C-alpha cells in the first residue's frame with residue numbers, strides 16, 4: 001500500500017543513522033530490478049542525497065551507499081550519466097583510497113560499471129582522477145581488488161585514442177606486461193583484455209605496447225593448451241597487427257607466423273576464425289610482410305580452407321587470400337559491464 005519513493009527520499013536527509021540506512025536499503029532493493037525502476041528511483045530525487053552520503057564519516061552508510069550506487073550503475077547509460085551529473089565520481093576515487101577492502105571492492109565495481117559507457121563518461125571518470133589510483137592498485141596482492149582494477153582499466157582503455165593515451169600516461173603498461181607471465185589464468189584473462197583494448201588505438205599506442213616487451217609473451221602463449229588464453233592472445237595479437245607496417249614487422253619478428261600457420265589447420269572454429277583475423281590484419285600492409293606470410297606456407301592452407309563447409313570461415317579465408325595477392329585492417333574493443 002502506497003509508494004515507497006517519497007518516504008525513502010525524505011529519510012535520505014534524516015539525521016538518524018538507523019532509519020537513514022533503512023532508506024538506503026530500500027533504495028538498493030528498489031534499484032535492484034528493472035531499468036524503469038532505477039529511473040523511477042532517480043526521478044524520485046535520491047541521487048543528490050546518495051552523493052552526499054558517499055562523503056559520510058559513517059562506514060555503514062558509506063558501504064550502503066556503495067551498494068545502492070552499484071545497483072543504479074547496472075542500468076542504462078542515461079542513468080549512469082545522471083549519476084555522473086550528481087557529482088559522485090570524486091567520492092568514488094577517494095573511496096578507492098580506503099583501507100576497507102569491502103568498500104574498496106564495491107567502489108571498484110561502481111567505477112568499472114560506470115566506465116562501460118560512452119567516451120564522455122570515460123573522460124569524466126578520468127578527470128575525477130581514477131587512473132593513478134588504479135595503476136597503484138595494479139600492484140596489490142589482493143586478487144579481488146586486482147581483478148576489479150584490471151577490469152576498470154580495460155573498460156577505460158576501451159574508449160577513444162585520447163583515453164588510451166591517458167591510461168598509458170598513468171604508467172600501467174609495465175605492470176600489465178609483468179602480469180602477462182602470471183600463473184593465475186583469471187587475472188591473465190583480464191590482463192590480456194586490458195592490453196588488447198589498449199592496442200585497439202592509434203599506431204603510437206601499439207608501438208608503446210610493443211616497446212613494453214609484450215610481443216614475446218603473446219608469441220609464447222600462442223602455443224598454450226588453454227583455448228581461452230589462446231583466443232585472448234589471438235585477440236591481442238590481431239589488435240597489435242592492425243597498425244602500421246612497422247608494427248606488423250615487429251609482430252613477424254616475434255615469430256608469430258609459424259604458430260598462426262599451424263593454427264590454420266585446427267578443428268576449433270573459434271580458433272580458426274581468430275587465426276584468420278590475425279593473418280588478415282597481418283596481410284594488411286607492406287609487401288615485405290605479405291611475402292613473409294607467403295613463405296610461411298599460408299597460401300596453401302588458405303586455398304584449402306576455401307573448401308571448408310562453414311561459410312564464414314570460407315569467406316574470410318577468401319578475403320585473406322585476396323588481401324595476400326592484391327596490394328594493401330580491423331580493430332576490436334571489449335567492455336565489461338555487470339549487474340547485481
Ligand SMILES: [Ca+2]
Nearest residue numbers: 098099100101
Ligand atoms: Ca583493511
Ligand SMILES: [Ca+2]
Nearest residue numbers: 140141142143
Ligand atoms: Ca594474494
Ligand SMILES: [Ca+2]
Nearest residue numbers: 182183184185
Ligand atoms: Ca594457475
Ligand SMILES: [Ca+2]
Nearest residue numbers: 224225226227
Ligand atoms: Ca585444452
Ligand SMILES: [Ca+2]
Nearest residue numbers: 266267268269
Ligand atoms: Ca570443430
